[PDB]
Ligand binder design. Structure first.
Ligand SMILES: *[C@@H]1O[C@H](CO)[C@@H](O[C@@H]2O[C@H](CO)[C@@H](O[C@@H]3O[C@H](CO)[C@@H](O)[C@H](O)[C@@H]3O)[C@H](O)[C@H]2NC(C)=O)[C@H](O)[C@H]1NC(C)=O
Ligand SMILES: CC(=O)N[C@@H]1[C@@H](O)[C@H](O)[C@@H](CO)O[C@H]1O
Ligand SMILES: *[C@@H]1O[C@H](CO)[C@@H](O)[C@H](O)[C@H]1NC(C)=O
Ligand SMILES: *[C@@H]1O[C@H](CO)[C@@H](O)[C@H](O)[C@H]1NC(C)=O
Ligand SMILES: *[C@@H]1O[C@H](CO)[C@@H](O)[C@H](O)[C@H]1NC(C)=O
Ligand SMILES: *[C@@H]1O[C@H](CO)[C@@H](O)[C@H](O)[C@H]1NC(C)=O
Lengths: 655, 379
């Protein structure tokens, strides 16, 4: 028979070369049994008129496959869509010659589509390879918010989670925007010094301008971008000495015609040798039915390994995209592009050239500029972290110890200064206390410098499930530390199972338990007044604490906490005031704070001994360099005797 | 004005006249004049020419679709047209009412259906209540199988119970392939509960093969989403009795009733926008010219078109062209080969008609589990 193929080409000069090449392939292939046939149409600007022309072509022949390319119009998105939509109704395979977008590889929308050129999303592989090569592990990702932007991030994150790297903060920006400065200002405070850019050529220019304005291109900083972020408007404003890449045969449109014709001519014989010679429909109106053999032809087409083309051996991937495509690493020296390396199938091989980093250095600039300044969060507590208003001049009030010694204090910013209602008023206050003295000693003994700021929410920290979602989120000091707003927690934090999974703690510096506060038989195992809720006595604590979760993990104390859920305070002072005026009945909390309050505030007595065991510890993010240092310093302080005199000064004033 | 289009059924000339007749149906404040169009066959040029001609010679503001024999690859053309000519449309039934997740950026499709996430949520809310936790997941080589396989795992971690998974298998259940290999793979399985995802032809092939390899008796339970099971009014052979699916509300209404809902939702959307600005946006229907950058007026109208409520039925479309928070109803195959309701779902709480799962046999006579007993008590 006379099998016939179709094609949509740009300038109709490619059509003559296509016909010549298909005739040459007909001469080379075939054993005088099957002859292939050719016909083509030019691309027109209206998409609807395009589709009408497409099935005009479809009626014009028993088309077996379609080859589509791009016109000189830079709008490369919507041009190869209508032919895919029309030729997917009958499962007639269509091959994209030089299309690079990441939405055509979703094999549920575009039902029958192939590519002879890998998409933009496959660029993350070389980033990963050259990232291992230069021993970089501290990464900043910066990708646009479009669907094409959100596809490279998925694959790169999959690779890094496979290696459990867990790349640092990734930043999303709305495409087509001005004043992108805010995101860069948020990112500059981080530690990593290599950032990855992937966006449209227009957004690359404004990002480059913002980076130049904020001097994020200084020495040490190393950039690496994609193929679409170098050429165009971005090349003028591009910072000097940034790594990039390009494809070998991009936009050639001459080798792609040849190898697509070759692979199609190779596949037609294997299709026809399968006793499924059923012809494609002849007419875009005639038959409302799919091709009976289209899926088989597509399947045999994908697994067709070609021998050797102009661009080399070609083989398709399970998702339909072309695999094993090898790039060319690019660098910008003196506004003149020069190649510095060649990508292989997997690895990258440099080629007799030296890199020029943005600062003009000659050695491999290591990332992660180490940080000595780190922010520290704190919460207000009675015997640990006193907080007081600042003096009128601006400093702190000058006080002295009873034994003739200065009291060490720090300047602390923090909250609205009015818990119930205030939009934003972060007036700095004055902080001092036993925990603060320990912090001062630790800061002195390890050369680092602190910037103490109080907490925003005011809660110690718990885990809650946000509504309309199952992904648990940490709320309070825990959330502040996890997000990145803090680098250490120097506060009476209780060590337990729920926190150890996401935090590397330190050795305890003070042991404490749990008691109850009664104004002056409430046992610890079970009280029938507590086991069976009453009308007068209320057994409840401050919300978002650890005791709340501990009671929510119980069975009969679960009933106690169900009765308690109607009552939940917000601070220790509120509970103290409520229980001092007989308004509150029961309150259970730590042994140290309660003992200090009873020693100071008379007529109040704790009931029972410490029926539980726990300890206080400094909290830090997992895998932090300061943990071992801090733990050994705390142990040395315990052995020295410092804690003894410090506790004698603060915890018990000879009561 | 509102257009109406039918497709691929018994010739609805009487239905078309009955739809065109109520030029003032008093279903909403103000009623734009309705007009009807009917295509003989479903095809790319046929559909394109009919819609372009109607919307270019009528100056229509909204258009309502009606589905067909339920063949795939038809909603994409509607998405393409709505993206090009910026006219809001709405699919109501059949195969064109299957959720398309990555729709075009500037498109306004609004097809009424449920994504795989909500259907899987409802299915796992019926597995938990009867406490099965077997999880024999079977999926064919379908275009959307990866999404289903990701969704089941995502939901499995979004509940309290452990949900001990047993096995997931993917097999070629197409028209052509080695039946012996699939027979061997099906012959080796052990789980009291199965969840399957495939197409109607794939469903019939898989169920016939399971009947061959003895996996359809009173011991096991099968579950499928709404993608399979096809027409809902003609259950074929080899479909196990006790099949469980989840379909949205209005699974038993009439074709005329559905169109009445389609015109009502457009009318309320215009009326709600009317209270805001006291106007109806002009049509933009130059299919031949194909002009139009991003337009703020039509964008605002579409944004106001999202939420609607009338006759005690909440229709709230997500940014993606599917409605959110519907009231699904679970259905099952009775002992006499007839779909029947089993359990409702309404604001996240599931109900059931039966306190225990009725188990039938080859010769009926519902068997009763020997190791199950009923306990009476009071407070
Ligand atoms: C393929 O083999 C067939 C052998 O019959 C030939 O295909 C024919 O190719 C011509 C030229 O492209 C087609 O003519 C077309 O006619 C329409 C309407 O008259 C006109 O508008 C077009 O511009 C075009 O000239 C013809 O339809 C087509 N016929 C068939 C059956 O395929 C041809 O010799 C071989 N090559 C190609 C490219 O088809
Ligand atoms: C699939 C593939 O790329 N194979 C090899 C690669 O492992 C090797 O690194 C390169 C030369 O360096 O030659 C080629
Ligand atoms: C493009 O391909 C042609 C033929 O395949 C080849 O001769 C040429 O070197 C390639 N590059 C350019 C820039 O034309
Ligand atoms: C890149 O293409 C293939 C893939 O490995 C390889 O044979 C070739 O030598 C590489 N370099 C160039 C310049 O093509
Ligand atoms: C922690 O201990 C190390 C090793 O003893 C020493 O360099 C220094 O005391 C601390 N290092 C850092 C980086 O803080
Ligand atoms: C949502 O519903 C309100 C209540 O009628 C309506 O005013 C509004 O236009 C609707 N749409 C949006 C986008 O708010």
């Amino acid at each position: 028979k006379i099998v016939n193929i179709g094609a949509v080409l740009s300038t109709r000069k490619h059509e003559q070369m296509f016909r010549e090449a298909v005739n040459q392939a007909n001469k080379r292939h075939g054993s005088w049994k099957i002859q292939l046939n050719a016909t083509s149409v030019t691309h027109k600007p209206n998409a609807i008129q395009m589709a009408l022309s497409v099935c005009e072509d479809l009626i014009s022949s028993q088309v077996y496959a379609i080859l589509v390319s791009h016109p000189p119009t830079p709008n490369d998105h919507f041009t190869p869509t209508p032919v895919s939509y029309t030729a997917g109704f009958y499962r007639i395979p269509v091959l994209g010659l030089t299309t690079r977008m990441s939405i055509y590889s979703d094999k549920s929308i575009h039902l029958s589509f192939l590519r002879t050129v890998p998409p933009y999303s496959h660029q993350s592989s070389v980033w990963f390879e050259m990232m291992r090569v230069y021993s970089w592990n501290h990464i900043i990702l910066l990708v646009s918010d479009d669907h094409e932007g959100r596809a490279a991030q998925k694959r790169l994150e999959t690779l890094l989670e496979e290696r459990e790297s867990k790349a640092e903060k990734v930043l999303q920006f709305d495409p087509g925007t001005k004043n992108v400065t805010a995101l860069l200002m948020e990112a500059k405070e981080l530690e990593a010094r290599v950032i990855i850019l992937s966006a449209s050529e227009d957004d690359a220019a404004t990002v480059y301008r913002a980076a130049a304005m904020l001097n994020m291109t200084g020495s040490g900083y190393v950039w690496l971008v994609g193929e679409r972020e170098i050429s165009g408007n971005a090349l003028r404003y591009a910072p000097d000495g940034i790594l990039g890449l390009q494809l070998i045969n991009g936009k050639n449109e001459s080798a792609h015609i040849s190898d697509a014709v070759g692979v199609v001519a190779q596949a037609v014989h294997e299709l026809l040798e399968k006793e499924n010679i059923t012809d494609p429909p002849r007419g875009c109106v005639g038959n409302t039915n799919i091709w009976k053999t289209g899926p088989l032809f597509k399947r045999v087409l994908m697994s067709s390994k070609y021998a050797d083309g102009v661009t080399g051996r070609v083989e398709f991937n399970e998702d339909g995209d072309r695999k094993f495509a090898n790039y060319s690493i690019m660098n910008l020296q003196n506004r003149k592009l020069v190649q510095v390396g060649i990508y292989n199938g997997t690895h990258v091989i440099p080629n007799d050239r030296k890199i020029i980093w943005p600062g003009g250095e000659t050695e491999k600039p290591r990332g992660y500029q180490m940080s000595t300044r780190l922010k520290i969060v704190t919460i207000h507590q009675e015997p640990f972290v006193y907080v007081k208003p600042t003096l009128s001049d601006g400093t702190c009030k000058e006080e002295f110890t009873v034994n003739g010694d200065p009291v060490k204090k720090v300047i602390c910013t923090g909250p609205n200064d009015t818990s119930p209602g205030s939009p934003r008023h972060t007036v700095p206050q004055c902080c001092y206390g036993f925990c603060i003295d320990l912090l001062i000693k630790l800061a002195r003994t390890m050369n680092f410098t602190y910037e103490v700021h109080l907490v925003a929410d005011g809660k110690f920290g718990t885990q809650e499930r946000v509504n309309n979602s199952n992904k648990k989120e940490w709320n309070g000091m825990m959330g502040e530390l996890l997000s990145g707003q803090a680098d250490m927690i120097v506060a009476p934090l209780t060590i337990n199972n729920e926190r150890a999974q996401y935090i590397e703690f330190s050795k305890p510096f003070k042991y404490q338990g749990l008691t109850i506060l009664v104004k002056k038989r409430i046992t610890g195992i079970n009280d029938p007044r507590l086991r069976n809720p009453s009308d007068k006595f209320i057994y409840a604590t401050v919300k978002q604490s650890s005791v709340d979760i501990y009671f929510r993990r119980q069975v009969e104390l679960s009933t106690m906490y169900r009765h308690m859920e109607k009552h939940n305070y917000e601070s220790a002072a509120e509970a103290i005031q409520a229980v001092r005026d007989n308004k509150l009945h029961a309150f259970i909390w730590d042994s140290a704070v309660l003992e200090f309050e009873a020693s100071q505030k008379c007529d109040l007595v704790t009931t029972g001994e410490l029926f539980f065991r726990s300890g206080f510890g400094i909290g830090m993010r997992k895998d932090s360099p300061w943990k071992q240092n801090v733990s050994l310093s705390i142990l040395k302080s315990h052995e020295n005797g410092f804690m003894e005199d410090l506790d004698k000064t603060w915890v018990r004033y000879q009561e | 004005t509102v257009a109406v289009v039918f497709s691929s059924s018994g010739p609805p000339q009487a239905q078309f006249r009955a739809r065109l007749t109520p030029q003032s149906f008093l279903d909403l404040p103000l009623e734009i004049q309705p007009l009807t169009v009917g295509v003989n066959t479903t095809n790319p040029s046929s559909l394109l020419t009919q819609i372009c001609g109607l919307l270019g010679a009528a100056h229509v503001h909204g258009i309502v679709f009606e589905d067909n024999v339920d063949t795939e690859a038809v909603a994409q053309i509607l998405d393409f047209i709505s993206s090009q000519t910026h006219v809001p449309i709405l699919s109501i039934s059949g195969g064109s009412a299957v959720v398309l997740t990555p729709k075009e950026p500037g498109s306004a499709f609004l097809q009424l259906g449920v994504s795989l996430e909500q259907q899987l949520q409802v299915l796992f809310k019926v597995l938990e209540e009867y406490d099965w936790s077997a999880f024999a997941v079977i999926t064919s080589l379908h275009p959307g199988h990866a999404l289903f396989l990701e969704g089941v795992r995502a939901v499995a971690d979004a509940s309290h119970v452990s949900w001990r998974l047993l096995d997931v298998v993917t097999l070629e259940l197409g028209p052509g392939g080695p039946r012996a290999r699939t027979q061997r793979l099906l012959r080796q399985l052990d789980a009291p509960v199965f969840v399957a995802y495939c197409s109607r032809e794939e469903a019939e092939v898989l169920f016939a093969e399971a009947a061959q390899a003895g996996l359809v008796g009173p011991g096991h339970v099968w579950l499928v989403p709404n993608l399979a099971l096809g027409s809902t009014d003609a259950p074929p052979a080899t479909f196990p009795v006790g099949l469980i699916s989840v379909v949205t509300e209005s699974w038993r209404l009439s074709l005329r009733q559905k169109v009445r809902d389609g015109v009502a939702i457009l009318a309320l959307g215009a009326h709600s926008y009317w209270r805001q600005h006291g106007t109806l946006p002009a049509p933009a229907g130059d299919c031949r010219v194909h002009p139009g950058p991003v337009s703020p007026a039509r964008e605002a109208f579409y944004r106001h078109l999202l939420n609607v409520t009338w006759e005690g039925r909440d229709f709230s479309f997500s940014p993606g062209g599917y409605l959110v928070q519907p009231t699904m109803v679970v259905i099952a195959l009775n002992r006499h080969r007839l779909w029947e309701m089993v359990g409702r779902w309404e604001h996240g709480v599931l109900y059931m008609k039966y306190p225990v799962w009725p188990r039938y046999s080859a010769s009926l006579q519902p068997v009763v589990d020997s190791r199950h007993l009923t306990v009476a008590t009071l407070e």
